[PDB]
Design a binder for this molecule. Structure first.
Ligand SMILES: O=c1ccn([C@@H]2O[C@H](COP(=O)(O)OP(=O)(O)O)[C@@H](O)[C@H]2O)c(=O)[nH]1
Ligand SMILES: [Mn+2]
Length: 287
């Protein structure tokens, strides 16, 4: 039985939020003892999964770099399985994987609107968790493909349910957050409520918890469709609603998904992952 004090030291980063009102640590560089955690999880022989979708030109623009960086930085020292979801397997970049890495690849149907491509991921992930992921890993992370690992993204990020603080709003007040504000939407979060603004580019936890996250989020996505409304930030709006109602047991600082367009302020000590520059004119086909 692992105890928070065994690996997490919030006093190492006193200038930032390291603990939520419901506890749950906010993992910042310097606060975690990866050595302790690696030993602990290794003795449990855990396996970590990672899902990533690449539909359309996202394949050529980002899949190879994402996979290459993940192979080098994601849960090094532990068995990892990459679940690649593409609409065209013939364009699948097959890179050489290193020790403790392996993958499988699935062909999925490409949604017409990029907004649905992004949102339908919630449905697909759920189907795969029930079909096989629940039997193959102990923890699973679901990520956007348009980003690249820059440094070790390890076991210090594992937990029941894990959320990512969005790089651009981590210092803002809830009323500034771009939550969906229309009551007609299932993702609606009224002003006066909210803890943080989570990035949908990264989320995870145990297969069971991620299954519930994706389910619920997808149900909200379907509900909105029946009410002829679409959340402002699509799956992200819904994810934030979910995490408001079901608090994550662990949150990652913006160091784990950083936007260099912001520059590199004092709080961001060591970047583990960074956003790829947006290229919508090429990778997206509809407004
Ligand atoms: O045409 C599309 C739209 C989205 N995606 C996937 O859905 C995620 C969400 O999209 P995007 O990264 O474009 O969202 P943004 O972070 O720029 O809001 C992407 O990382 C991809 O994994 C995709 O493969 N093809
Ligand atoms: Mn993205």
């Amino acid at each position: 039985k692992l105890k928070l004090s065994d690996w997490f030291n919030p006093f190492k980063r006193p200038e930032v939020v390291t603990m939520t009102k419901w506890k749950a640590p906010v993992v910042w560089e310097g606060t975690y003892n990866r050595a302790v955690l690696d030993n602990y999880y290794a003795k449990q022989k855990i396996t970590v999964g990672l899902t990533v979708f690449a539909v359309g030109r996202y394949i050529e623009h980002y899949l190879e770099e994402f996979l290459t960086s993940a192979n080098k930085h994601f849960m090094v020292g532990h068995p990892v399985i990459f679940y690649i979801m593409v609409d065209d397997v013939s364009r699948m970049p097959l890179i050489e994987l290193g020790p403790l890495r392996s993958f499988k690849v699935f062909k999925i149907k490409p949604e017409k609107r990029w907004q649905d491509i992004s949102m339908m991921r919630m449905k697909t992930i759920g189907e795969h968790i029930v079909a096989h992921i629940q039997h193959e890993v102990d923890f699973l992370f679901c990520m956007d493909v348009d980003q690249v690992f820059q440094d070790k993204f390890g076991v210090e990020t594992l937990g029941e349910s894990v959320a990512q603080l969005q790089a651009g709003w981590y210092k803002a007040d809830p009323n500034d957050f771009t939550y969906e504000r229309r009551k007609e939407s299932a993702a609606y979060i009224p002003f006066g409520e909210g803890d943080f603004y989570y990035h949908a580019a990264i989320f995870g936890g145990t297969p069971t918890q991620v299954l519930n996250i994706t389910q619920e989020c997808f149900k909200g996505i379907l509900k909105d469709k029946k009410n002829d409304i679409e959340a402002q930030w699509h799956d992200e709006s819904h994810l934030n609603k979910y995490f408001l109602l079901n608090k994550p047991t662990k949150i990652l600082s913006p160091e784990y998904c950083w936007d260099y367009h912001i520059g590199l302020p004092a709080d961001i000590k060591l970047v583990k992952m960074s956003w790829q520059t947006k290229e919508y004119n090429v990778v997206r086909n509809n407004v």
